[PDB]
Design a protein around this ligand. Structure first.
Ligand SMILES: NC(=O)c1ccc[n+]([C@@H]2O[C@H](COP(=O)([O-])OP(=O)([O-])OC[C@H]3O[C@@H](n4cnc5c(N)[nH+]cnc54)[C@H](O)[C@@H]3O)[C@@H](O)[C@H]2O)c1
Ligand SMILES: NC(=O)c1ccc[n+]([C@@H]2O[C@H](COP(=O)([O-])OP(=O)([O-])OC[C@H]3O[C@@H](n4cnc5c(N)[nH+]cnc54)[C@H](O)[C@@H]3O)[C@@H](O)[C@H]2O)c1
Ligand SMILES: OCc1c(F)c(F)c(F)c(F)c1F
Ligand SMILES: OCc1c(F)c(F)c(F)c(F)c1F
Ligand SMILES: [Zn+2]
Ligand SMILES: [Zn+2]
Ligand SMILES: [Zn+2]
Ligand SMILES: [Zn+2]
Lengths: 374, 374
């Protein structure tokens, strides 16, 4: 048995910013109390993982990144009650401790045990389970899914349906749930409304899915890469616009197209300028804009607060506003009942060993989601 | 009779910025089609009127300001159906045309016929009803209440209870309704919640009234003028804090006081810094912050969008989110039914001829609302 023992396995270690991942052997300690060690089956490449590489997102290095994944429990530490060895699970990059003021709140999901706001790159106990070349390696968001085995705190894992296809449902661990929830839960898109979605990657496509599910009459996709438009229309966009085609700023174009502003807009890119543009293009009196994209570290946007005084609502969210541990199993169940589709987001499949090629595909603009198989 | 004739009367004309009002004779044309001429009875001094004087707000000059008032209809133009001569009325600085997309929207109140966004300083027809010393004088927000008589568009006036005390209910024309609605309608303050209110003038006090009416457990008033604290506690503040008393930024103080951030915060001053502070002090995952204050013309704030990404909601409003013509008569009816109090807001009552003294009282920090009586 491997239970109670250090596992040697391959992981994708990021030693330095702006460098390829190094696929090499790591040592994965056994789980301590209220920890779970997971044999990974599939992990998606989310733009936020790339942000770690580019320095857009600052987290301590060296690191094992990865946060969108699914696997099978190898072993559980003392006191674990919510998963067992052999269970299929999705790591939760937003934990759900169930005890903090946010977890107890009907609408909050950004559990105070998160490692996002001020990343330490550790387990909840402030230590690491990973060694590489004899050196400690940081965790990422308590998940570190770019490894054949990871160890996560119990509050950062959800048991999912035993019959789930892990190579699909890993997307519920970040990109699908985030985009879909941003529309259906956070914005609360209404039937007959007009939506504008900035950024047509995996997350933006999932926003469109949610807007369509909510009954939006018009869903305007916005991207500077027109190659993204065909898939956006397939999943529900009624029109697509490329800001580069227009002389005027796209907020003006979108205001004109929507006869005075859209009902709901979404920033699904990660740029300060598009966050302000997305706000501006919603109707000034009753529009709602949701920020989903991750901004470059420590940078402030500039905006005129008259955009809000007139009546706009501006909000953001992590993980689509979903309470993670409650929601992930339900989302999987709904997927299994064909309530939504994940295949439109999956454009490439690669073995884990080809992780760098998977990032190249994202960076070139060619992929939506590449799923890596272990 | 005056009907159908030019009225010569007294008004407070602002000829240029940063100068006293000139109290002198103006000529007031009779109302054209769909216009209403009102004999003013009482008008309040709102900080937004002072913003015109100070240049914080830009609107065409020379101007007859004033927007918080009540009076009695002197005459109506052809086609007016909603008021008649002799009716008590409140001018509506936010109109309610009933036809535009905002008026038709269940939540929106910032009617597209407003003269706030891009002020012209005219009637709806692009002309003025005021002359002074042979010169045309601009209107202000379609109301211009600093005059013994004004002319307003029908969409900018509401009929109110004939038994209403006009020297109190004029506050429903701006400051009471704005603050109360910002809490009860826009923020939707919840029972048992913790609120922070920045600025304890007439509008901030009305926010406190609304937070208390909504059942907030804690209502923390914030002002740099500690003389404002006693009245804030009278109307429901459970604690008051002066940022000047602390070595740390007040957002940190308020986060600590509320064991991790407030449920609802309100900016009721008009400063960019306090807008960002008020946002920051609400709980990062589920907090709501509402901007009520009017900041200086054309200035942008700077903020880190991570404040929103974690889950905060940021909104603003004009006139407390109330659809003006529907809401004003109901608010007056509620006042007459003793559902809320207005006396706590009224610190001074002066003749109209003392308008400048009234503004000096506001600027010195001594008054909440001065009511000017004609
Ligand atoms: N809030 C959350 O919980 C959460 C979850 C997942 C992803 N994210 C972030 O969401 C963003 C999108 O992630 P993704 O879908 O994986 O990324 P992606 O696949 O890189 O998609 C981004 C899209 O934005 C497009 N784009 C780039 N610049 C512009 C521009 N100026 N105007 C219009 N379109 C432009 C780009 O062409 C691409 O199709 C990233 O910033 C992620 O870090 C946030
Ligand atoms: N959104 C609307 O529809 C609407 C309606 C009415 C008023 N307003 C605006 O709301 C604001 C308040 O109006 P009001 O109540 O008549 O004004 P006011 O009576 O001057 O009250 C403002 C209060 O803010 C206090 N203050 C000033 N600087 C600070 C600071 N740094 N920190 C904390 N407190 C501070 C000040 O001492 C005073 O008590 C003004 O900007 C108005 O223009 C907006
Ligand atoms: O893609 C999800 C995601 C986020 F939304 C973040 F805000 C973040 F910091 C991060 F590391 C992450 F992975
Ligand atoms: O006090 C109400 C009020 C406002 F909220 C404004 F935004 C404004 F421009 C103005 F002139 C005004 F009077
Ligand atoms: Zn929690
Ligand atoms: Zn992600
Ligand atoms: Zn209207
Ligand atoms: Zn006012």
């Amino acid at each position: 048995s491997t239970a109670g023992k250090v596992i040697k396995c391959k992981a994708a270690v990021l030693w330095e910013e702006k460098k390829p991942f190094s696929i090499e052997e790591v040592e994965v300690a056994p789980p301590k109390a209220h920890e779970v060690r997971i044999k990974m089956v599939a992990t998606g490449i989310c733009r936020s993982d790339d942000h770690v590489v580019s320095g857009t997102l600052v987290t301590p290095l060296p690191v094992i990144a990865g946060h969108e994944a699914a696997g099978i429990v190898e072993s559980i530490g003392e006191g674990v009650t919510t998963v067992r060895p052999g269970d299929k699970v999705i790591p939760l990059f937003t934990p759900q401790c169930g005890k903090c003021r946010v977890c107890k709140h009907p609408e909050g999901n950004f559990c105070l045990k998160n490692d996002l706001s001020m990343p330490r790159g550790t387990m909840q106990d402030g230590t690491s389970r990973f060694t590489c070349r004899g050196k400690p390696i940081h965790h990422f968001l308590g998940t570190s899914t770019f490894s054949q085995y990871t160890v996560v705190d119990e509050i950062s894992v959800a048991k999912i349906d035993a019959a789930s296809p892990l190579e699909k449902v890993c997307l519920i661990g970040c990109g699908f749930s985030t985009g879909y929830g941003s529309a259906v839960k956070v914005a609360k898109v209404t039937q007959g409304s007009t939506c504008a979605v900035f950024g047509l990657g995996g997350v933006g496509l999932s926003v469109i899915m949610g807007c369509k599910a909510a009954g939006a009459a018009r869903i305007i996709g916005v991207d500077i890469n027109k190659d993204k438009f065909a898939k956006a229309k397939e999943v529900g966009a009624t029109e697509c616009v490329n800001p580069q085609d227009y002389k005027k700023p796209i907020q003006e174009v979108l205001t004109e197209m929507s006869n005075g502003g859209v009902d709901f807009s979404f920033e699904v890119i990660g740029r300060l300028d598009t966050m302000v543009t997305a706000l501006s293009c919603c109707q000034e009196a009753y529009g709602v804009s949701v920020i989903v994209g991750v901004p470059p570290d420590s940078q402030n946007l500039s905006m005129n607060p008259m955009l809000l005084l007139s009546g706009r609502t501006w909000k953001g969210c992590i993980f689509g506003g979903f309470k993670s541990k409650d929601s992930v199993p339900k989302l999987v169940a709904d997927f299994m009942a064909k309530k939504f589709a994940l295949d439109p987001l999956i454009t490439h499949v690669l073995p884990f060993e080809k992780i760098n090629e998977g990032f190249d595909l994202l960076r070139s603009g060619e992929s939506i989601r590449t799923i890596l198989t272990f």
